[PDB]
Amino acid sequence: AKGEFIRTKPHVNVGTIGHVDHGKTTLTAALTYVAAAENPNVEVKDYGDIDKAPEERARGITINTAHVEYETAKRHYSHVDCPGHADYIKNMITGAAQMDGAILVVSAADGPMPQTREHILLARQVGVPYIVVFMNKVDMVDDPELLDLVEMEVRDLLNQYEFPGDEVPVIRGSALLALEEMHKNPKTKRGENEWVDKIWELLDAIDEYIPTPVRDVDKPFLMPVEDVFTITGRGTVATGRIERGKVKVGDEVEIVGLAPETRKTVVTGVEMHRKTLQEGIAGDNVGLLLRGVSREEVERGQVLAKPGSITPHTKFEASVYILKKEEGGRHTGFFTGYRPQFYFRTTDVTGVVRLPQGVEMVMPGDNVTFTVELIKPVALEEGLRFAIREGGRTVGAGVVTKILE
RNA sequence: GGCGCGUUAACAAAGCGGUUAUGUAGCGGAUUGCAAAUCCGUCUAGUCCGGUUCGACUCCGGAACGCGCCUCCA
Ligand SMILES: Nc1nc2c(ncn2[C@@H]2O[C@H](COP(=O)(O)OP(=O)(O)NP(=O)(O)O)[C@@H](O)[C@H]2O)c(=O)[nH]1
Ligand SMILES: [Mg+2]
Ligand SMILES: [Mg+2]
Ligand SMILES: [Mg+2]
């Protein structure tokens, strides 16, 4: 008769991002294990429990995001483990759309790779405010001077995308060794093992660097949909991180974006990690039960909002920076008619570029402003950041400056 | 969420890194006494957006839509 989520401690959303195989998943399992040893609430999550799909089992990689909860002495967490493969960045963006802070995982053996800087840029344009790096796989590095070099380059990479690279906490360690340790003896506490302690160093960094975001509960409700489930006996459920406002049961909301209609529905449920919540407020990784709505009347990319608060749009001008050749972007310029993919929070959508009279071409590494017309409407705001991806690579990072309509 | 499959002109159906495959009706037009048979003409050719190239329907990327199969239970 179920289990309510009591706000004993402040809740913050986190996740793991970084190049493929750098360790994101192992560290996630490691986090739940060490945190559990101290806090008995944390349900342990093993590597197999993270990458559970058969494609992930055989192919040996994280293809879609995984949601895991744990907590320290100070705050509760909702951890979203992201894919590092270049082919599945589409899903990496969706995870970053729910992070109040992100853990940048960088293998000491390889250093900052293509998806390292790619996730920095992307996470930024999807809302991720602060970052906590974690030099993983130190157990494979002999020369200490090399680890210094790794740390230095990761700081430069953060400062390249306007993050506070010099102030960002860089915790060296080894997720594999810490996880292994937690298996042999799960009673292990702080100060008992050096590898386990390096993970506690991490939890402490998260606790002290990533602040508990200012909650905008005074603004109109807005809940970017991240996932849609079909729960037997209950109905259709939407999940995501509340951006602003609050939501108690019996509240009416609109499903805006990716559809001509602006469907209405009443909420018959609200839960934070399988736990019923009184009323989910901003920063909550909820799960709302939508009345009358079917398994396909709502989808990721849309947005649950206060009825009337948002009116979906398609046209808009924005200030954009086209990535350079050596940033994983284009090597050739483009013109009007170019139809790339645009990313606004949990939304991916094709749009057409309309260059202004006076400009004919746009070269890589140029900061330019232009109009865009999406093939579908979506919750847009002046100031909202976004991404432009095409051909498997990110090509531009922009900011909405005026909604044409 | 993932993987696969389908997209050439009004429709049908090919080959090919470059100098015109091709068929078939709907319409138009010569023509017929009027038709018919037969020719002349017609119609978004490579769904769309990028890359390689002197050159792309053809090669490599992406996207849209459609359809299947797993995954997807706060
Ligand atoms: N030597 C060593 N190996 C490690 C460490 N952490 C993880 N590994 C190993 O490195 C490999 C990749 O780890 P991973 O699966 O990524 O935890 P990923 O970044 O989640 N992968 P993906 O990007 O595909 O989602 C695995 O073989 C894992 O066991 C570490 O600290 N040291
Ligand atoms: Mg992983
Ligand atoms: Mg089939
Ligand atoms: Mg459930």
Side-chain angles (χ1 to χ4, degrees), chain A residues 245-293:
Chain A
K246 306 165 289 163
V247 62
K248 63 184 63 170
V249 295
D251 282 353
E252 187 185 86
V253 299
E254 287 182 355
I255 311 175
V256 344
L258 308 172
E261 65 173 7
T262 310
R263 214 172 186 296
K264 282 178 166 179
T265 179
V266 179
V267 310
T268 47
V270 46
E271 303 192 332
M272 171 104 83
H273 289 295
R274 278 61 51 168
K275 279 167 285 171
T276 306
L277 211 295
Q278 176 181 102
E279 84 154 333
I281 67 172
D284 296 24
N285 191 214
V286 303
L288 311 182
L289 181 63
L290 303 176
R291 175 182 171 175
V293 182

Short mmCIF file of all heavy atoms in Angstrom, two decimals, chain A residues 245-293:
data_model
loop_
_atom_site.label_atom_id
_atom_site.label_comp_id
_atom_site.label_asym_id
_atom_site.label_seq_id
_atom_site.Cartn_x
_atom_site.Cartn_y
_atom_site.Cartn_z
N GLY A 245 6.88 25.01 -12.05
CA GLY A 245 5.56 24.74 -11.52
C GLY A 245 5.47 23.54 -10.60
O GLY A 245 6.49 23.02 -10.14
N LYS A 246 4.25 23.09 -10.35
CA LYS A 246 3.99 21.95 -9.48
C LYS A 246 2.86 21.13 -10.12
O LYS A 246 2.22 21.59 -11.07
CB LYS A 246 3.55 22.43 -8.10
CG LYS A 246 4.49 23.42 -7.42
CD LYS A 246 3.81 24.11 -6.24
CE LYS A 246 2.75 25.10 -6.73
NZ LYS A 246 1.79 25.50 -5.65
N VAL A 247 2.62 19.93 -9.60
CA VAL A 247 1.56 19.09 -10.15
C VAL A 247 1.01 18.06 -9.16
O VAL A 247 1.67 17.06 -8.85
CB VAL A 247 2.01 18.40 -11.47
CG1 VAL A 247 3.19 17.47 -11.23
CG2 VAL A 247 0.85 17.65 -12.11
N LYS A 248 -0.18 18.34 -8.65
CA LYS A 248 -0.86 17.44 -7.71
C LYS A 248 -1.91 16.68 -8.51
O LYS A 248 -2.23 17.07 -9.63
CB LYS A 248 -1.53 18.25 -6.59
CG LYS A 248 -2.62 19.20 -7.07
CD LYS A 248 -3.20 20.05 -5.94
CE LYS A 248 -2.14 20.97 -5.33
NZ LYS A 248 -2.74 21.97 -4.41
N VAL A 249 -2.44 15.60 -7.95
CA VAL A 249 -3.45 14.82 -8.65
C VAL A 249 -4.71 15.65 -8.89
O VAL A 249 -5.00 16.59 -8.15
CB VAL A 249 -3.81 13.54 -7.89
CG1 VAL A 249 -2.61 12.61 -7.84
CG2 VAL A 249 -4.28 13.87 -6.48
N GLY A 250 -5.43 15.30 -9.95
CA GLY A 250 -6.64 16.03 -10.28
C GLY A 250 -6.37 17.28 -11.11
O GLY A 250 -7.31 17.95 -11.54
N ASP A 251 -5.10 17.60 -11.32
CA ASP A 251 -4.72 18.77 -12.11
C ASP A 251 -4.82 18.51 -13.60
O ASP A 251 -4.43 17.45 -14.09
CB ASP A 251 -3.29 19.21 -11.78
CG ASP A 251 -3.19 19.98 -10.48
OD1 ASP A 251 -4.24 20.30 -9.88
OD2 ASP A 251 -2.05 20.27 -10.06
N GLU A 252 -5.32 19.49 -14.33
CA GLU A 252 -5.47 19.38 -15.78
C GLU A 252 -4.26 19.99 -16.48
O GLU A 252 -3.80 21.08 -16.11
CB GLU A 252 -6.75 20.09 -16.22
CG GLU A 252 -7.10 19.91 -17.68
CD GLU A 252 -8.30 20.73 -18.09
OE1 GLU A 252 -8.12 21.92 -18.43
OE2 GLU A 252 -9.43 20.20 -18.04
N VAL A 253 -3.73 19.28 -17.48
CA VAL A 253 -2.57 19.73 -18.24
C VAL A 253 -2.74 19.49 -19.74
O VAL A 253 -3.53 18.64 -20.16
CB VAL A 253 -1.27 19.01 -17.79
CG1 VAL A 253 -0.98 19.29 -16.33
CG2 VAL A 253 -1.37 17.50 -18.04
N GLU A 254 -1.97 20.22 -20.54
CA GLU A 254 -2.02 20.09 -21.99
C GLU A 254 -0.77 19.47 -22.57
O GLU A 254 0.35 19.78 -22.14
CB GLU A 254 -2.21 21.45 -22.65
CG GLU A 254 -3.59 22.05 -22.50
CD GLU A 254 -3.73 23.38 -23.22
OE1 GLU A 254 -2.73 23.88 -23.77
OE2 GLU A 254 -4.86 23.92 -23.23
N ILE A 255 -0.95 18.61 -23.56
CA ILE A 255 0.15 17.95 -24.25
C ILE A 255 0.43 18.80 -25.50
O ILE A 255 -0.23 18.63 -26.53
CB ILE A 255 -0.24 16.52 -24.68
CG1 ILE A 255 -0.86 15.76 -23.49
CG2 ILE A 255 0.98 15.79 -25.21
CD1 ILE A 255 -1.38 14.38 -23.85
N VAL A 256 1.40 19.71 -25.40
CA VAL A 256 1.73 20.59 -26.52
C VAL A 256 2.95 20.15 -27.33
O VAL A 256 3.92 19.62 -26.79
CB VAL A 256 1.91 22.08 -26.06
CG1 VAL A 256 1.30 22.29 -24.67
CG2 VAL A 256 3.37 22.51 -26.08
N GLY A 257 2.90 20.39 -28.64
CA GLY A 257 4.00 20.03 -29.52
C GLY A 257 3.84 18.72 -30.27
O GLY A 257 3.09 17.84 -29.84
N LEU A 258 4.53 18.61 -31.40
CA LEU A 258 4.52 17.43 -32.26
C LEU A 258 3.13 16.90 -32.61
O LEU A 258 2.91 15.68 -32.63
CB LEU A 258 5.36 16.31 -31.63
CG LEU A 258 6.79 16.63 -31.20
CD1 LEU A 258 7.36 15.45 -30.43
CD2 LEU A 258 7.66 16.96 -32.40
N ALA A 259 2.20 17.81 -32.88
CA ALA A 259 0.83 17.45 -33.22
C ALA A 259 0.00 18.72 -33.42
O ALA A 259 0.20 19.71 -32.72
CB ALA A 259 0.21 16.58 -32.13
N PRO A 260 -0.92 18.71 -34.40
CA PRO A 260 -1.79 19.85 -34.69
C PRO A 260 -2.63 20.22 -33.47
O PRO A 260 -2.85 21.40 -33.18
CB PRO A 260 -2.66 19.33 -35.83
CG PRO A 260 -1.74 18.42 -36.56
CD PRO A 260 -1.04 17.68 -35.45
N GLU A 261 -3.08 19.20 -32.75
CA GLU A 261 -3.89 19.39 -31.55
C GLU A 261 -3.04 19.81 -30.36
O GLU A 261 -1.81 19.84 -30.43
CB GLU A 261 -4.64 18.09 -31.20
CG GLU A 261 -3.73 16.92 -30.81
CD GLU A 261 -4.50 15.69 -30.30
OE1 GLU A 261 -5.75 15.67 -30.37
OE2 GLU A 261 -3.84 14.73 -29.84
N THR A 262 -3.71 20.16 -29.27
CA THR A 262 -3.06 20.56 -28.03
C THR A 262 -3.91 19.88 -26.96
O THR A 262 -4.52 20.52 -26.10
CB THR A 262 -3.09 22.10 -27.84
OG1 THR A 262 -2.62 22.73 -29.04
CG2 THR A 262 -2.19 22.52 -26.69
N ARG A 263 -3.94 18.55 -27.06
CA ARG A 263 -4.72 17.68 -26.19
C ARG A 263 -4.75 17.97 -24.68
O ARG A 263 -3.73 18.27 -24.06
CB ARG A 263 -4.32 16.22 -26.42
CG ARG A 263 -5.46 15.25 -26.26
CD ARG A 263 -5.07 13.85 -26.68
NE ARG A 263 -6.21 12.94 -26.67
CZ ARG A 263 -6.91 12.60 -25.58
NH1 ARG A 263 -6.59 13.10 -24.39
NH2 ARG A 263 -7.92 11.75 -25.69
N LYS A 264 -5.94 17.87 -24.12
CA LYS A 264 -6.14 18.09 -22.69
C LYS A 264 -6.27 16.75 -21.97
O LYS A 264 -6.70 15.75 -22.56
CB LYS A 264 -7.40 18.91 -22.45
CG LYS A 264 -7.26 20.40 -22.71
CD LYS A 264 -8.59 21.09 -22.48
CE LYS A 264 -8.44 22.60 -22.39
NZ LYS A 264 -9.77 23.24 -22.19
N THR A 265 -5.93 16.76 -20.69
CA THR A 265 -5.99 15.57 -19.86
C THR A 265 -5.86 15.94 -18.39
O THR A 265 -5.32 16.99 -18.04
CB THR A 265 -4.86 14.57 -20.23
OG1 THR A 265 -4.93 13.42 -19.39
CG2 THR A 265 -3.49 15.23 -20.08
N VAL A 266 -6.38 15.08 -17.52
CA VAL A 266 -6.30 15.28 -16.08
C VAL A 266 -5.33 14.25 -15.50
O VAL A 266 -5.32 13.09 -15.94
CB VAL A 266 -7.68 15.14 -15.40
CG1 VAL A 266 -7.56 15.34 -13.91
CG2 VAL A 266 -8.67 16.14 -16.00
N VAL A 267 -4.51 14.67 -14.55
CA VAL A 267 -3.55 13.77 -13.93
C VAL A 267 -4.18 12.96 -12.81
O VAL A 267 -4.80 13.50 -11.89
CB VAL A 267 -2.27 14.51 -13.43
CG1 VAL A 267 -1.71 15.41 -14.54
CG2 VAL A 267 -2.56 15.31 -12.17
N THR A 268 -4.07 11.64 -12.94
CA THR A 268 -4.61 10.70 -11.97
C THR A 268 -3.48 10.01 -11.18
O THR A 268 -3.72 9.04 -10.46
CB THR A 268 -5.44 9.63 -12.69
OG1 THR A 268 -4.68 9.18 -13.79
CG2 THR A 268 -6.77 10.21 -13.18
N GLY A 269 -2.27 10.54 -11.31
CA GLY A 269 -1.12 9.99 -10.62
C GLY A 269 0.13 10.84 -10.80
O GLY A 269 0.26 11.59 -11.76
N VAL A 270 1.06 10.71 -9.85
CA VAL A 270 2.31 11.45 -9.86
C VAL A 270 3.28 10.69 -8.96
O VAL A 270 3.04 10.57 -7.75
CB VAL A 270 2.12 12.93 -9.39
CG1 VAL A 270 1.28 12.98 -8.12
CG2 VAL A 270 3.46 13.61 -9.16
N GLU A 271 4.36 10.17 -9.54
CA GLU A 271 5.33 9.39 -8.77
C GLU A 271 6.80 9.63 -9.05
O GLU A 271 7.20 9.78 -10.20
CB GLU A 271 5.07 7.89 -8.96
CG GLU A 271 3.67 7.44 -8.59
CD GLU A 271 3.53 5.94 -8.52
OE1 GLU A 271 4.27 5.23 -9.23
OE2 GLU A 271 2.67 5.47 -7.74
N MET A 272 7.59 9.60 -7.99
CA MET A 272 9.03 9.77 -8.08
C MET A 272 9.65 8.41 -7.73
O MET A 272 9.61 7.98 -6.58
CB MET A 272 9.51 10.83 -7.08
CG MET A 272 11.02 10.91 -6.93
SD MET A 272 11.77 12.31 -7.76
CE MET A 272 11.51 13.60 -6.53
N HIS A 273 10.15 7.72 -8.75
CA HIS A 273 10.77 6.41 -8.59
C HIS A 273 9.87 5.39 -7.91
O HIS A 273 10.09 5.02 -6.76
CB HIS A 273 12.08 6.53 -7.80
CG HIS A 273 13.20 7.17 -8.56
ND1 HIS A 273 13.76 6.61 -9.69
CD2 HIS A 273 13.89 8.32 -8.34
CE1 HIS A 273 14.74 7.38 -10.13
NE2 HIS A 273 14.84 8.42 -9.33
N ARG A 274 8.83 4.96 -8.63
CA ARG A 274 7.89 3.96 -8.11
C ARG A 274 7.24 4.37 -6.78
O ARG A 274 6.58 3.56 -6.13
CB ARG A 274 8.59 2.60 -7.95
CG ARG A 274 8.75 1.72 -9.21
CD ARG A 274 9.57 2.34 -10.35
NE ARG A 274 10.88 2.86 -9.94
CZ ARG A 274 11.84 3.23 -10.79
NH1 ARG A 274 11.66 3.14 -12.10
NH2 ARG A 274 12.96 3.76 -10.33
N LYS A 275 7.42 5.63 -6.38
CA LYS A 275 6.87 6.13 -5.12
C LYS A 275 5.90 7.29 -5.29
O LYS A 275 6.25 8.32 -5.87
CB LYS A 275 8.00 6.54 -4.17
CG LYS A 275 8.64 5.38 -3.40
CD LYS A 275 9.94 5.82 -2.74
CE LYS A 275 11.05 5.95 -3.76
NZ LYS A 275 12.28 6.57 -3.20
N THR A 276 4.69 7.14 -4.75
CA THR A 276 3.65 8.17 -4.84
C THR A 276 4.06 9.45 -4.14
O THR A 276 4.45 9.43 -2.97
CB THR A 276 2.31 7.68 -4.24
OG1 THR A 276 1.93 6.44 -4.85
CG2 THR A 276 1.22 8.71 -4.49
N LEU A 277 3.96 10.56 -4.86
CA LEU A 277 4.31 11.86 -4.31
C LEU A 277 3.05 12.70 -4.11
O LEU A 277 2.10 12.61 -4.90
CB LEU A 277 5.26 12.59 -5.27
CG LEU A 277 6.30 13.54 -4.69
CD1 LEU A 277 5.66 14.74 -4.02
CD2 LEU A 277 7.17 12.80 -3.71
N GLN A 278 3.04 13.48 -3.03
CA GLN A 278 1.92 14.36 -2.69
C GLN A 278 1.65 15.23 -3.92
O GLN A 278 0.58 15.16 -4.53
CB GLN A 278 2.33 15.22 -1.50
CG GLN A 278 1.35 16.28 -1.05
CD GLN A 278 1.90 17.07 0.13
OE1 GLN A 278 2.37 18.19 -0.02
NE2 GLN A 278 1.87 16.45 1.32
N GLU A 279 2.65 16.03 -4.29
CA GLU A 279 2.58 16.88 -5.47
C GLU A 279 4.01 17.13 -5.94
O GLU A 279 4.84 17.66 -5.21
CB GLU A 279 1.84 18.20 -5.20
CG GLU A 279 2.65 19.33 -4.58
CD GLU A 279 2.10 20.71 -4.91
OE1 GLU A 279 1.44 20.87 -5.96
OE2 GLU A 279 2.33 21.66 -4.12
N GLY A 280 4.31 16.65 -7.14
CA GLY A 280 5.64 16.83 -7.69
C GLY A 280 5.91 18.27 -8.03
O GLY A 280 5.08 18.93 -8.66
N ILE A 281 7.04 18.79 -7.59
CA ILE A 281 7.40 20.17 -7.88
C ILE A 281 8.58 20.18 -8.85
O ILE A 281 9.00 19.13 -9.32
CB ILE A 281 7.75 20.94 -6.61
CG1 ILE A 281 9.03 20.39 -5.98
CG2 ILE A 281 6.58 20.87 -5.63
CD1 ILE A 281 9.56 21.21 -4.81
N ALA A 282 9.11 21.36 -9.14
CA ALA A 282 10.24 21.48 -10.06
C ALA A 282 11.45 20.65 -9.60
O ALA A 282 11.69 20.48 -8.41
CB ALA A 282 10.64 22.94 -10.22
N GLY A 283 12.18 20.10 -10.57
CA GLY A 283 13.35 19.30 -10.28
C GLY A 283 13.05 17.85 -9.94
O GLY A 283 13.95 17.09 -9.64
N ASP A 284 11.77 17.48 -10.02
CA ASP A 284 11.37 16.12 -9.71
C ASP A 284 11.30 15.22 -10.94
O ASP A 284 10.76 15.59 -11.98
CB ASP A 284 10.01 16.11 -9.01
CG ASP A 284 10.04 16.79 -7.65
OD1 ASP A 284 10.92 17.65 -7.42
OD2 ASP A 284 9.17 16.47 -6.82
N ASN A 285 11.89 14.03 -10.81
CA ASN A 285 11.89 13.04 -11.88
C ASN A 285 10.61 12.23 -11.66
O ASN A 285 10.65 11.10 -11.16
CB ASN A 285 13.12 12.14 -11.77
CG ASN A 285 13.33 11.27 -12.99
OD1 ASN A 285 13.80 10.14 -12.88
ND2 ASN A 285 12.97 11.79 -14.15
N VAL A 286 9.48 12.83 -12.02
CA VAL A 286 8.17 12.21 -11.84
C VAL A 286 7.70 11.25 -12.93
O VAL A 286 8.40 10.97 -13.91
CB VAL A 286 7.06 13.28 -11.63
CG1 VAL A 286 7.39 14.16 -10.44
CG2 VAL A 286 6.88 14.12 -12.89
N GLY A 287 6.49 10.74 -12.72
CA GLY A 287 5.83 9.83 -13.64
C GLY A 287 4.36 10.13 -13.48
O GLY A 287 3.74 9.69 -12.50
N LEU A 288 3.80 10.91 -14.40
CA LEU A 288 2.39 11.30 -14.35
C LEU A 288 1.46 10.38 -15.13
O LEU A 288 1.75 10.00 -16.27
CB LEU A 288 2.23 12.73 -14.88
CG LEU A 288 3.17 13.80 -14.30
CD1 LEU A 288 2.83 15.16 -14.89
CD2 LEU A 288 3.05 13.85 -12.80
N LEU A 289 0.35 10.00 -14.50
CA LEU A 289 -0.65 9.14 -15.15
C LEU A 289 -1.68 10.04 -15.84
O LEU A 289 -2.38 10.82 -15.19
CB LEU A 289 -1.32 8.23 -14.12
CG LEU A 289 -2.38 7.23 -14.61
CD1 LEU A 289 -1.78 6.23 -15.57
CD2 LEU A 289 -2.99 6.51 -13.42
N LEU A 290 -1.76 9.94 -17.16
CA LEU A 290 -2.68 10.75 -17.95
C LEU A 290 -4.01 10.08 -18.30
O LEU A 290 -4.05 9.03 -18.96
CB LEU A 290 -1.95 11.26 -19.20
CG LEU A 290 -0.67 12.05 -18.92
CD1 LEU A 290 0.03 12.43 -20.21
CD2 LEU A 290 -1.00 13.28 -18.09
N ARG A 291 -5.10 10.72 -17.87
CA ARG A 291 -6.47 10.25 -18.09
C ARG A 291 -6.97 10.40 -19.53
O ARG A 291 -6.77 11.43 -20.17
CB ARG A 291 -7.40 11.00 -17.13
CG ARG A 291 -8.89 10.73 -17.29
CD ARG A 291 -9.69 11.56 -16.31
NE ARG A 291 -11.13 11.51 -16.57
CZ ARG A 291 -12.05 12.07 -15.79
NH1 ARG A 291 -11.69 12.74 -14.70
NH2 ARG A 291 -13.34 11.97 -16.10
N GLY A 292 -7.62 9.35 -20.04
CA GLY A 292 -8.16 9.37 -21.39
C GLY A 292 -7.12 9.22 -22.48
O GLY A 292 -7.41 8.72 -23.57
N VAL A 293 -5.90 9.66 -22.19
CA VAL A 293 -4.79 9.59 -23.13
C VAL A 293 -4.39 8.15 -23.39
O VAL A 293 -4.38 7.32 -22.48
CB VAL A 293 -3.57 10.35 -22.59
CG1 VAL A 293 -2.42 10.31 -23.60
CG2 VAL A 293 -3.96 11.79 -22.28
#
